[PDB]
């Protein structure tokens, strides 16, 4: 079972360092050329950086050239890449992927399976965690829950514990002039389970580590 | 589609090899042993080296890898690698020359059920001690003793393996019809014994091996000859 | 190294090492293949085998490790480890013990026309019937047959190693000489299939006259 | 050990370490090797086979200066040890070996010190060809090589060089190989007379062959004759 | 080499050397297995073993391994390393203290129809039933039992290329002839 | 710089067949891939070599190469084929090619919007300000517009809107129209709406509250 | 079990088999060594080496690769590949003509503390320096000189287990008795 697993992203300062690291497990680690592409929020896919065992050969864009390092850790089956000087062009989720070949390159080249990635954010913004506040109601109905002041990115929400997975709608976030990060995520209901069924929404918040849990009634 | 290959993914996506076939860590696995003599290949007197060709039934349960042949387009049996199971890592301890091992990793064969059965053939070098009184008309007493490199008995433990009938075989097995006799030794007997010892409250834990005698004579037709 | 690095970087995109270099379906790699004899180690009569320590000489052509020097920092000549390169399959068709290998694979040599050069050394037990009429007062005809185990002719292309000199090179002052043999000739010769799975061989020929002193002497 | 953990990232995951290449500014620059062996113990001379069996300890002595660090950055570390895997290594062989075994025995740990100087101590046993003067024989003495060099790269590449010792202040090179005084079990048949060490370089070699450049151990032996004086010589001659 | 690399490629995506190389699972692989000679090595009377150079040609068809030589610049037939692949676990039942299965992986030639043929070499050390009655008069009859050592004739049918063994390429021995050979 | 050219979105019904091109010089000449890539998921690989199928991909996707233009088939469109394709190429001077990803967009039929409206809760009247949620629920096309009133006055610089991807299993849209004020200016107005306009209501339908 | 597949997980995602498995690097690793002797497999005069069969038991406590067993199903102890953990490089000094260190990884058992043990087996051939005066009638005082072959006092520090080597196990010799045994 093919596996690469994402993890060392986060928040940091422009110029600051980060490493990237993805553990893979399913498949000979040595056997395919493993990569780094990113993808900017709202843009498209942007391949980094590559590895290559045969030669022990590496491979950057760029734009990066200088300041990033791909290397694999010499025992386990874990690919890093090593940032530095970061900007805030930088600033993209960051998928592992294997290759479907040994080597880097030739047209053949492509990248077989992709892990889910992680993200990195570049800016001088400090962490902050969510201000909850419900959707009261005032024929079916409708609640939701208002997440508010949080950076960065993401809120994870859900409902009674994960039970109610039904006609949920979680938004994207929204930018203010403030700087901070804002969603609401709603369930539509019959009217009649207003008084009857508990709706409680659950927001996680992991670069704060902040877990608030609000009940919602009218 | 191969069957095999859906049976192979739905077993083996998501397995562990490197840890026991138990629900609990205090249970134990229960391993039935066969060992079948092919060929006594040579008793070196001045080494002390008993030279075997053998090879090794070993059955066992393992739940993770249940399944029905109903569910698999009537599949009763699978062939993998042996390294992607895993093994109780029975070795011959009182080897001579340090090979420990099986001369050949043979597939395993899971059965429906959860029973998997691995026979992989070995050539073994062993330790008898020539007892040289009454040489070149003697007899020797060469052991085979097997036991889990890794596991103490209560992790690992061992069972012979039974015949048709069910009748326990706790000796080394013999084709009779693929057997070609030594040409200076003859296997007289060779029974075997599941030892349990060193299960002291100051021990500890204890531990268990596999003991098969070898109860060999020599035919001195060489010797009355020639010397 | 960085130039030699990113030269590495350019020749190693999207190389195959287990794939033979053919630019066009039907082209020929074609090997020169030849012999340096560095210790004849002995002939056993007991075993019927010729023990030899020698270094291999192996040329070809692979068209994907070629390079322009002019872009690379002048580079005109590369040190690769054998492994990560196309080999042809070439090996010791009648060795003894069942070694077909070279001893270690080292390193070959890549020119910037994509030439590769690669000299492994190889310790190699080969069979050699034993003429035993005139034993002690005997010489033998030992030969060394190489070819590739696995490419028919149609794929590799076997010659005679030189540069034509067909014989197997014995350095003067670095060669370990035996003391029971005398080597009289040393020719090589590429011997063609009877006349598709046909394949070339490259024989290294070693008569070689046994000096029977240590018998006049002893019986 | 945080702290060489976060060393052995700095090195090798922060600077991209290829230990494929040679510590090297310029490709046309040749890195110095420095070679000492100590002779642990003398196995055996085979004379029907012609082969000398040694347990040597073969010194090596190179700088890569990927491989430097700022001790006070770093817990004031001045030595790592590392797989030789992990570093490119000046790969040295036994060439006059008559067994096939080119390369040292266990591949033991480099010890890497902060000013980038890499050391390395592999252990081996070597078989190697030594041919047998029999003219003098139960009174003969041997003249055994050990001859290394490198396949892998020329003498463009690497430089070979013995070892060099201090001594107040004074430098000196260790032209001899090394035996510990006490530590040393001589041989039950030969006693070592000479030990010489010598870099050999063949001016007729082009620089870019393998056989330009070796460094070379000798043993001058001589046999203790005393068990074929005792065993043969006195009883034929009587 | 470009078109070849491709192939290669493309050719061991979703491969899986475990399972038989089969379009259905009741199906039989058909192996057609042939010994060459090339040496009778050694016949040790005393410890009744016969040592022999052989190779053991193995033909048979991975369903899998086959593609239109037209999409791949008309190549036809390739060479890739046998450990990447399925191949049938033949062993010599009657080693005596040699190796029982082929540790030589020789590479395999591979045809667009997925025709395989692999011809590793070994060195049998078999034994043989060595009846001295007749030294140095004596006549041997010395066989060699092969067949696949996990798999049953269910699943995978081993077949003779020929009614005799290939002494084509037979050094001719110093110490013995042989008189008759014959697979069964 | 071999610049792959994608188009941004394509659009189609359910049932009929999607043609997603990636242009390009010469691109006949090379291998191009294709990756899929739903919302907030990782891509996944659906051709590779310009006709290949990866084991678990659905038939009903294809690919084709010719000229200067590579193209993926995707026929028999369903209501879970939504996401960004994304053409890949290596050349030997630019490394890694990938193109500038097409949208997917299933166009099924009119659905209109069901409109709800939230006032802030106490808990954040607590805090210091004030904010106005109304949703859009389950509509299509995406066109609509929300327009806040208070007191009569239309809102201007102080409301943000939220758009939501075509859903999985009835290809919908979902909007969130969020006004935030300050508390004096909350207070300072009694009646606060939203109004709706899509082009699947007979006139546009407002949702209002008095504070 | 599951439990311990998550703990290896758990433990094995960014550990360092380079690194010496203590939490300051200015500590040393504390290693206790003990000696089994199985066999004395042979005594070679001319050459001066003794053939043994040993057990080379290696006790030490590994820094980060401890757990809570509650955490994990009740598991107190599991069984860990060798090569995935770091490992002392002990080396038989006075080597004659066999392996330098140990070549059989066999796998350590690892505690829930921490503590690892390791007795993996080897055969060594030490130089002994033989005394032919008295022979046959000779005495033979043959030792094993063994040390972390690139670590220092001041990084690894080991210990002895015993101040005798464990002849528990001990298969009687038929050539020579063992009088006395002692490690300093
Ligand atoms: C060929 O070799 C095999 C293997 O060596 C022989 O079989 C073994 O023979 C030995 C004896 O030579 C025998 O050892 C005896 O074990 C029993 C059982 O031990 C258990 O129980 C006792 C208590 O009953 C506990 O003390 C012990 O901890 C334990 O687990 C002992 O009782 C017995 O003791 C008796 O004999 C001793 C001398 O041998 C004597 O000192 C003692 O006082 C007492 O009288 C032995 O120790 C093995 O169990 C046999 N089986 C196995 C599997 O090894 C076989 O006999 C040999 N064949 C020929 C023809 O010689
Ligand atoms: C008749 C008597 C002398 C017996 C015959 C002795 C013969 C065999 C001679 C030939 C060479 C001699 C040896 C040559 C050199 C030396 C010198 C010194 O190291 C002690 C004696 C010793 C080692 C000699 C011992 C006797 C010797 C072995
Ligand atoms: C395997 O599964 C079947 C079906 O649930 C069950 O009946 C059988 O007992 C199981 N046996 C095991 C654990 O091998
Ligand atoms: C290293 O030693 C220096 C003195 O030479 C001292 O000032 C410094 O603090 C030490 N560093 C550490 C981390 O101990």
């Known amino acids: 079972e093919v596996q690469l697993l994402e993890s060392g992203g986060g928040l940091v300062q422009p110029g600051g360092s980060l490493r990237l690291s993805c553990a893979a497990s399913g498949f000979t680690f040595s056997d395919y050329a493993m990569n780094w592409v990113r993808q900017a929020p709202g843009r498209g896919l942007e391949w980094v950086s590559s590895f290559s065992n045969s030669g022990g050969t590496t491979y950057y864009t760029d734009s990066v050239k200088g300041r990033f390092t791909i290397s694999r850790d010499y025992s386990r089956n874990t690919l890093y890449l090593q940032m530095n000087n970061l900007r805030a062009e930088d600033t993209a989720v960051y998928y592992c992927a294997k290759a479907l070949t040994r080597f880097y390159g030739g047209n053949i080249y492509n990248f077989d399976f992709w892990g889910q990635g992680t993200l990195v954010t570049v800016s001088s913004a400090s962490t902050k965690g969510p201000s909850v506040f419900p959707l009261a109601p005032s024929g079916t109905a409708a609640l939701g829950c208002l997440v508010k002041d949080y950076f960065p990115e993401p809120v994870t929400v859900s409902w009674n514990s994960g039970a109610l997975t039904s006609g949920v709608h979680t938004f994207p976030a929204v930018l203010q002039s403030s700087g901070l990060y804002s969603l609401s995520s709603v369930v539509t209901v019959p009217s009649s389970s207003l008084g009857t069924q508990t709706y409680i929404c659950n927001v996680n918040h992991k670069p704060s580590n902040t877990k608030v849990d609000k009940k919602v009634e009218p | 589609k191969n069957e095999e290959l859906r049976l192979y993914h739905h077993l083996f996506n998501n397995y562990d090899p490197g840890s026991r076939p138990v629900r609990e860590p205090e249970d134990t696995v229960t391993i039935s042993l066969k060992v079948t003599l092919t060929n006594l290949i040579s008793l070196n007197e001045k080494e002390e080296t008993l030279t075997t060709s053998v090879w090794i039934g070993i059955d066992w349960q393992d739940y993770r890898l249940n399944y029905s042949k109903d569910d698999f387009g009537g599949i009763e049996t699978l062939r993998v690698p042996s390294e992607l199971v895993w093994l109780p890592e029975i070795v011959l301890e009182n080897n001579i020359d340090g090979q420990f091992g099986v001369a050949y990793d043979a597939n395993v064969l899971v059965y429906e059920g959860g029973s998997v059965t691995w026979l992989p053939p070995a050539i073994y070098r062993s330790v008898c001690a020539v007892e040289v009184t009454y040489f070149p008309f003697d007899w020797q007493n060469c052991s085979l003793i097997f036991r889990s490199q890794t596991y103490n008995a209560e992790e690992v433990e061992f069972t012979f393996a039974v015949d048709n009938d069910g009748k326990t075989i706790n000796k080394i097995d013999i084709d009779t019809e693929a057997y070609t006799e030594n040409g200076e030794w003859a296997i007289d007997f060779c029974p075997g014994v599941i030892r349990r010892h060193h299960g002291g409250a100051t021990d500890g834990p204890g531990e268990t091996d596999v003991i098969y005698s070898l109860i060999i004579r020599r035919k001195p037709l060489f010797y009355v000859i020639n010397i | 190294s960085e130039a030699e690095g990113r030269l590495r970087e350019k020749l190693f995109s999207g190389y195959d090492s287990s794939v033979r270099p053919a630019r066009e379906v039907g082209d020929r790699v074609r090997v020169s293949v030849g012999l340096i004899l560095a210790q004849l180690i002995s002939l056993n009569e007991k075993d019927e085998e010729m023990s030899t320590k020698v270094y291999l000489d192996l040329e070809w052509t692979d068209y994907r490790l070629s390079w322009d020097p002019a872009e690379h920092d002048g580079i005109d000549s590369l040190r690769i480890t054998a492994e990560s390169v196309w080999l042809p399959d070439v090996v010791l068709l009648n060795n003894n013990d069942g070694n077909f290998d070279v001893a270690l694979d080292i390193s070959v040599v890549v020119s910037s026309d994509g030439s590769v050069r690669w000299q492994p050394p190889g310790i190699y037990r080969s069979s050699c019937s034993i003429q035993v009429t005139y034993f002690p007062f005997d010489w033998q005809n030992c030969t060394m047959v190489f070819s590739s185990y696995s490419y028919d002719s149609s794929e590799v292309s076997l010659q005679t190693g030189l540069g034509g000199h067909q014989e197997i090179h014995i350095h003067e002052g670095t060669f370990i000489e035996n003391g029971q043999w005398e080597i009289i000739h040393k020719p090589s010769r590429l011997i063609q299939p009877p006349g598709e799975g046909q394949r070339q061989e490259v024989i290294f020929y070693l008569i070689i006259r046994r000096k029977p002193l240590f018998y006049l002497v002893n019986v | 050990l945080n702290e060489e953990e976060r060393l052995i990232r700095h090195l090798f995951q922060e600077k991209g370490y290829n230990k494929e290449l040679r510590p090297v500014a310029h490709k046309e620059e040749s890195v110095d090797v420095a070679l000492a062996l100590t002779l642990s113990n003398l196995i055996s001379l085979k004379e029907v086979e012609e082969t000398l069996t040694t347990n040597v300890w073969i010194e090596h002595g190179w700088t890569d200066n990927r491989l430097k660090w700022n001790a006070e950055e770093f817990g004031n570390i001045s030595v790592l040890r590392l797989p030789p895997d992990m570093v490119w290594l000046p790969e040295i062989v036994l060439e006059n070996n008559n067994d096939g075994s080119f390369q040292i025995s266990y591949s033991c740990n480099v010890l890497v010190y902060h000013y980038g100087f890499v050391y390395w101590l592999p252990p081996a046993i070597f078989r190697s060809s030594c041919p047998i003067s029999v003219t003098y024989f139960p009174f003969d003495w041997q003249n055994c090589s050990l001859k290394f060099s490198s396949l892998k790269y020329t003498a463009k590449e690497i430089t070979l060089s013995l070892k060099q010792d201090a001594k107040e202040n004074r430098t000196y090179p260790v032209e001899w190989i090394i035996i510990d005084p006490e530590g040393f079990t001589e041989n039950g048949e030969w006693e070592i007379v000479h030990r010489p060490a010598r870099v050999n370089v063949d001016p007729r070699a082009p620089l870019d062959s393998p056989s330009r450049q070796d460094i070379t151990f000798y043993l001058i032996i001589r046999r203790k004759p005393l068990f074929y004086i005792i065993n043969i010589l006195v009883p034929c001659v009587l | ?184 | 710089s071999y610049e792959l050219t994608q188009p941004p979105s394509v659009s189609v019904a359910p049932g009929q067949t999607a043609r997603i091109t990636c242009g390009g010089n010469n691109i006949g000449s090379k291998s191009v891939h294709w990756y899929q890539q739903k919302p907030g998921q990782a891509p996944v690989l659906v051709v590779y070599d310009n006709s290949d199928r990866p084991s678990g991909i659905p038939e009903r996707l294809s690919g084709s190469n010719s000229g200067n233009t590579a193209t993926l088939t995707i026929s028999g469109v369903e209501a879970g084929d939504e996401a960004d394709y994304y053409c890949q190429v290596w050349d030997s001077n630019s490394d890694v090619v990938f193109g500038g990803g097409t949208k997917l967009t299933v166009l099924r039929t009119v659905a209109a919007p069901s409109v709800f409206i939230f006032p802030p809760s106490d808990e954040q009247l607590k805090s210091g300000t004030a904010s106005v949620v109304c949703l859009l629920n389950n509509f299509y096309p995406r066109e609509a517009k929300v327009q806040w009133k208070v007191d009569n006055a239309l809102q201007s610089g102080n409301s943000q809107e939220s758009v939501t991807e075509q859903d999985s299993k009835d290809s919908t849209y979902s909007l969130s129209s969020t006004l935030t004020l300050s508390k004096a200016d909350y207070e300072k107005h009694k009646v606060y709406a939203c109004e709706v306009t899509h082009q699947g209501l007979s006139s546009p339908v407002t949702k209002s509250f008095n504070r």
């Open chain 5, 1 to 184: 080499s470009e078109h070849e690399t491709r192939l290669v490629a493309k050719l061991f995506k979703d491969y899986s050397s475990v399972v038989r190389p089969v379009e259905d699972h009741r199906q039989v692989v058909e192996v057609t297995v042939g010994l060459q000679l090339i040496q009778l090595i050694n016949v040790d009377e005393v410890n009744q073993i016969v040592t022999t150079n052989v190779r053991l040609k193995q033909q048979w068809v991975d369903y899998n391994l086959k593609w239109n030589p037209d999409d791949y610049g008309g190549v036809k037939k390739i060479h890739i390393p046998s450990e990447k692949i399925w191949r049938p676990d033949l062993v010599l039942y009657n080693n005596a203290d040699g190796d029982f299965a082929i540790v030589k992986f020789t590479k395999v030639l591979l045809q667009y129809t997925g025709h395989i043929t692999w011809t590793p070499p070994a060195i049998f050390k078999s034994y043989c039933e060595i009846i001295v009655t007749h030294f140095p008069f004596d006549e041997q009859n010395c066989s060699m039992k092969l067949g696949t050592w996990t798999y049953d004739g269910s699943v995978v049918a081993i077949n003779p290329e020929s009614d005799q063994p290939d002494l084509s390429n037979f050094m001719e021995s110093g110490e013995w002839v042989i008189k008759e050979s014959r697979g069964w």
